[PDB]
Amino acid sequence: MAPQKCFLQIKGMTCASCVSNIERNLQKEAGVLSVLVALMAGKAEIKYDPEVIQPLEIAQFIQDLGFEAAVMEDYAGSDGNIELTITGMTCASCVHNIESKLTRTNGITYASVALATSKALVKFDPEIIGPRDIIKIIEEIGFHASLAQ
């Protein structure tokens, strides 16, 4: 398939085995078939399939099971749905301009640039355009967009 990794954290953690049950449950949810929870550090990295399963559906599963699933921020950074850290920018106008540049691209359907965090989410079709062109565009401005990942 096109496996996309999702970076989230759990809040709950009964301790002994509830995470362990949760892992098995998610392996049977739908398009997700990799669990990478570090119960030690307290992170759930997994690999879902966005065209079949969606993060909020996941959340519903976790909520039903009786935990909180909250993404770190980094909901993926993967295929179509990438994210970038934009360095050099330091003004709302620069944000607006970047977002204009992005939206100017045929494929990109929603961008969301968040300066307080200093990353940008980008939602395009990974065939008609590619990240390097976006990079080039912002290089032409004079920013640096590095996949924060």
Swiss-Prot record:
Cu(+) 5 binds at C15, C18. Changing G107S: In WD; uncertain significance. Isoform 1 may be proteolytically cleaved at the N-terminus to produce the WND/140 kDa form. Changing L65P: In WD; uncertain significance. Signal peptide: none annotated. It is found in: Golgi apparatus, trans-Golgi network membrane; Late endosome. Changing L8S: In WD; decreased copper transport activity; decreased ATPase activity; does not affect interaction with COMMD1. Cu(+) 6 binds at C91, C94. Most abundant in liver and kidney and also found in brain. Isoform 2 is expressed in brain but not in liver. The cleaved form WND/140 kDa is found in liver cell lines and other tissues. Changing G142A: In WD; uncertain significance; no effect on protein abundance; no effect on protein localization; may have an effect on copper transport activity; no effect on ATPase activity; does not affect interaction with COMMD1. Residues 4-70, 80-146 form the HMA domain. Each HMA domain can bind a copper ion, they are tightly packed and closely interact with each other. Wild-type ATP7B can usually be loaded with an average 5.5 copper atoms per molecule. Copper ion transmembrane transporter involved in the export of copper out of the cells. It is involved in copper homeostasis in the liver, where it ensures the efflux of copper from hepatocytes into the bile in response to copper overload. Belongs to the cation transport ATPase (P-type) (TC 3.A.3) family. Type IB subfamily. It is linked to Wilson disease: An autosomal recessive disorder of copper metabolism in which copper cannot be incorporated into ceruloplasmin in liver, and cannot be excreted from the liver into the bile. Copper accumulates in the liver and subsequently in the brain and kidney. The disease is characterized by neurologic manifestations and signs of cirrhosis. Monomer. Interacts with COMMD1/MURR1. Interacts with DCTN4, in a copper-dependent manner. Interacts with ATOX1. Interacts (via C-terminus) with ZBTB16/PLZF. This is Copper-transporting ATPase 2. It comes from Homo sapiens.
